[PDB]
């Protein structure tokens, strides 16, 4: 095996859910907000063509990746040129679009079409590489579940277009609501101060989704 970050996340979710944080005489959800736990990376767009090629995604920094159906991964860094390719074993190989690798043209070509299908820059100084990639994903009737290589799990809920970003290193959750406002909470402080029924319900769903990620392994 079980991934250690997913195991930690499962325990954190078990603890907050066991406190029944919405079933309280006094709910003070704002006191659990902690902007120091803000996620640096989240998935801003995705496109599911896994029936034929794979799942495309774009991160907040405008890098794009495709997780292909062979469990290999090709990422185009936000500079438009630098490529990271991850094998099924996890071995990482760094290339450029300028240099031409024949064994990867088809995947490189697909990545460009996926990028443009999702499309309608350095978002900060330096910060090259150490970019997370999509480890695995699955979808249900109500959500898509995205597990990133930095241990974060993002759950996008189709119906109301809300999102949860769970970070096990900081034991935090960021909730993006239908208005698209984002707020970051420490899970332990949600236990202490309570939260609304909606967030409590999504955290129960999240734990069920993390169980799935761990059972699939
Ligand atoms: O603009 C965003 C948005 S918009 C939605 Cl939705 C989620 C996020 N987000 C997370 S999550 N972490 N950081 C961000 N930022 C960056 C701004 C603080 C500088």
Numbering used by the authors: 369 to 488, 498 to 594
Q: What is written in the article reporting this PDB entry?
A:
pmcPolo-like kinase 1 (Plk1) is a mitotic serine/threonine (S/T) kinase, whose overexpression is closely associated with aggressiveness and poor prognosis for a wide spectrum of human cancers. Subsequent studies demonstrated that PBD serves as a structurally distinct protein–protein interaction (PPI) module for binding a short phospho-S/T (i.e., p-S/T)-containing motif. The polo-box domain (PBD), which serves as the substrate-recognition domain, is an attractive target for Plk1-specific anticancer drug discovery.
Analysis of the obtained structure showed that the two aromatic residues, W410 and F559, located 12.5 Å (Cα-Cα distance) away from each other, were critically required for Allopole-A binding. The indole ring of the W410 also tilted more than 20° to form another layer of the π–π interaction with the heterocyclic aromatic ring of Allopole-A (Inset). Moreover, P407 carbonyl established an H-bond with the Allopole-A triazole ring. Analysis with overlaid crystal structures showed that the L2 loop recruited to a phospholigand-bound PBD1 traverses over the W-F pocket and is not compatible with the Allopole binding to the pocket.
